[PDB]
Amino acid sequence: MLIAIEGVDGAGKRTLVEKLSGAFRAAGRSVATLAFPRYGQSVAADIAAEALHGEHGDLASSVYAMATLFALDRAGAVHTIQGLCRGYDVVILDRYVASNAAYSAARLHENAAGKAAAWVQRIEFARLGLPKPDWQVLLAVSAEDAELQQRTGAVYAELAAQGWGGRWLVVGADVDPGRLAATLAP
Numbered sequence: 243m244l245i246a247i248e249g250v251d252g253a254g255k256r257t258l259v260e261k262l263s264g265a266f267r268a269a270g271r272s273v274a275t276l277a278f279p280r281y282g283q284s285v286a287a288d289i290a291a292e293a294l295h296g297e298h299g300d301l302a303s304s305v306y307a308m309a310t311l312f313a314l315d316r317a318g319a320v321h322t323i324q325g326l327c328r329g330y331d332v333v334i335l336d337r338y339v340a341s342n343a344a345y346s347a348a349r350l351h352e353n354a355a356g357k358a359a360a361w362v363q364r365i366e367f368a369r370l371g372l373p374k375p376d377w378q379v380l381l382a383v384s385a386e387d388a389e390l391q392q393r394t395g396a397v398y399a400e401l402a403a404q405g406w407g408g409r410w411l412v413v414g415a416d417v418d419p420g421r422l423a424a425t426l427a428p
């Protein structure tokens with residue numbers, strides 16, 4: 243089973259990934275995890291992070307440019323992801339493809355039915371062949387540009403409400419991991 247944990251920065255995603263891992267293992271299930279972006283391993287990731295800090299000219303001015311780099315990062319790990327899905331009962335990703343839909347849409351003042359979010363699907367799932375997650379779990383918290391961060395949180399909620407790329411659950415900071423693991427299990 244492939245699960246992606248999503249949300250804005252400071253939502254506490256990694257804490258949830260770890261809480262979920264423990265719960266799945268307590269339930270008898272093997273777990274492996276990966277985090278995106280793969281800063282330090284992916285040149286595309288690194289150039290993207292670097293662009294957001296003003297390097298690489300006018301690169302960061304293009305939403306689709308940044309989205310492409312982050313996509314290329316994930317596409318590089320496609321064989322790793324498919325390997326974990328064979329080796330383990332549950333693979334949890336700290337960020338996945340929906341990060342690209344939410345952050346790009348938000349920046350472009352588009353909604354989840356908009357062009358960018360659709361493009362992301364065409365590019366990452368169809369073209370680049372990234373597997374669709376069985377579940378995407380949005381961690382939605384009150385407080386993690388802040389208007390952009392809150393707009394991203396909202397668009398996330400909209401991907402969840404529309405079942406973008408598959409089934410979602412939306413959860414809070416205090417969700418019970420044992421109960422969440424039971425809901426996610428096949």
Ligand SMILES: CCc1cc2[nH]c(=O)c(C#N)c(-c3ccc(NS(C)(=O)=O)cc3)c2c(C)n1
Nearest residue numbers: 251278279305308309312337341342345346349
């Ligand atoms: C310009 C539009 C745009 C598109 C994006 N697409 C992605 O796929 C993606 C991812 N993953 C991110 C991203 C990367 C790191 C983050 N947070 S972090 C690890 O704590 O630095 C938060 C978001 C992303 C961003 C920031 N912006």
Ligand code: NA
Nearest residue numbers: 349350351352
């Ligand atoms: Na727009």
